[PDB]
Design a protein around this nucleic acid. Structure first.
Ligand SMILES: [Mg+2]
Ligand SMILES: [Mg+2]
Ligand SMILES: [Mg+2]
Ligand SMILES: [Mg+2]
Ligand SMILES: [Mg+2]
Length: 182
RNA sequence: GUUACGGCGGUCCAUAGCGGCAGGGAAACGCCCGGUCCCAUCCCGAACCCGGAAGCUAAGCCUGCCAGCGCCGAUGAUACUACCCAUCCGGGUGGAAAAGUAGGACACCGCCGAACAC
C-alpha cells in the first residue's frame, strides 16, 4: 500500500534491465542493494571531544536515525589516540529509509556538490560494492547552512549483492548514480 | 520395507577436513514476503522475534564423481635403550622410534521422524 519512489523503480524497471543485460540463470541472482552505511571519522575528537556531538547531530539530520558512536579499538601515539575514545559515528540504513536516503542523495544532494563533475566509476571494492567520500555536509538540505560550525565530511558506502564490479556498476548506473566516463 | 529426505547423537573426533566437477526439491530443511501483535538494534525488523506462502533450488543443506592440497600410514631397516658380556673400541639378548616408502582415504555407526510402498 506504499513504496519509496526509487524502490518502485527498481522492482518495475531495473530488475528487468539487469536480467536482459547479464542474462542470469536464476532470478535469485539479480543484484540488489542491501544497506547503505554513512560513516564520519572525526579523528580530531581524540583531543577536542566536543566535535563528536556535531557529527552525531549532522548524521541524525542527514539520515533520519540516531548514529552509533564507534570507540577506538587500539591506542596509537602518533594520533594521540587512546583505546576507548569515541572517534567515529556510523549509521546503517536498511529497507524503506535506505531507499529514501538514496533517492534524496541521487536527486538533491549530489547535484548540490560544489563543482560536481560526477563520481568516479572505479571506486568498487572488487566485489561490486561502491564507496565514495564527501568533504562537506552543506549539500544536504536537511542541515541549515546558517548553523554549521565547521565543514564535516563523511564516507558513504553502498553495499550490493552483486558479485563483481561490472554488475554492481550497472545496477548503480540504472539507479541513477552520476558516473564519469573513462 | 526402500528412499538425491528432515532431526538428535557417537567416534581415544580429518581415513571424516579443504578444494574441484556435476546434479537434487514429494513431505521436510531453506533462502524468501511483510512488521499490526510478544519481542529486538550500544544505530539498523540485517540479526533476534512475531505474522505469512507470491517466488526460487541461485546459495545453505543433500547426493554422485575426482587423490590436487591437507590427513592417516605399515612391513623391513636404522637411531636410541634395559640388562648382560667386554682392560680403552665394541658386542649379545629383549624392547624399539622419528623421518621416509608401499599404500589407505572424498568417512562410518545408533535412535526418532517425514514421504511413499506393504
Ligand atoms: Mg516441495
Ligand atoms: Mg526482513
Ligand atoms: Mg545449484
Ligand atoms: Mg616399525
Ligand atoms: Mg612416521
Amino acid at each position: 500500500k506504499a513504496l519509496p519512489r526509487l524502490k518502485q523503480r527498481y522492482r518495475e524497471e531495473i530488475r528487468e534491465a539487469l536480467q536482459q543485460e547479464f542474462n542470469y540463470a536464476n532470478v535469485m541472482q539479480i543484484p540488489g542493494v542491501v544497506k547503505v552505511v554513512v560513516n564520519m571519522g572525526v579523528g580530531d575528537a581524540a583531543r577536542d571531544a566536543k566535535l563528536i556531538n556535531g557529527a552525531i547531530n549532522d548524521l541524525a539530520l542527514i539520515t533520519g536515525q540516531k548514529p552509533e558512536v564507534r570507540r577506538a579499538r587500539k591506542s596509537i601515539a602518533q594520533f594521540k589516540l587512546r583505546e576507548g575514545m569515541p572517534i567515529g559515528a556510523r549509521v546503517t540504513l536498511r529497507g524503506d529509509r535506505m531507499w529514501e536516503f538514496l533517492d534524496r542523495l541521487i536527486s538533491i544532494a549530489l547535484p548540490r556538490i560544489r563543482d560536481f563533475r560526477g563520481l568516479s566509476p572505479k571506486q568498487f571494492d572488487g566485489t561490486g560494492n561502491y564507496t565514495f567520500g564527501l568533504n562537506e555536509q552543506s549539500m544536504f538540505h536537511e542541515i541549515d547552512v546558517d548553523s554549521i560550525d565547521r565543514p564535516r565530511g563523511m564516507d558513504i558506502t553502498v553495499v550490493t549483492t552483486a558479485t563483481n564490479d561490472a554488475e554492481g556498476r550497472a545496477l548503480l548506473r540504472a539507479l541513477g548514480f552520476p558516473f564519469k566516463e573513462n
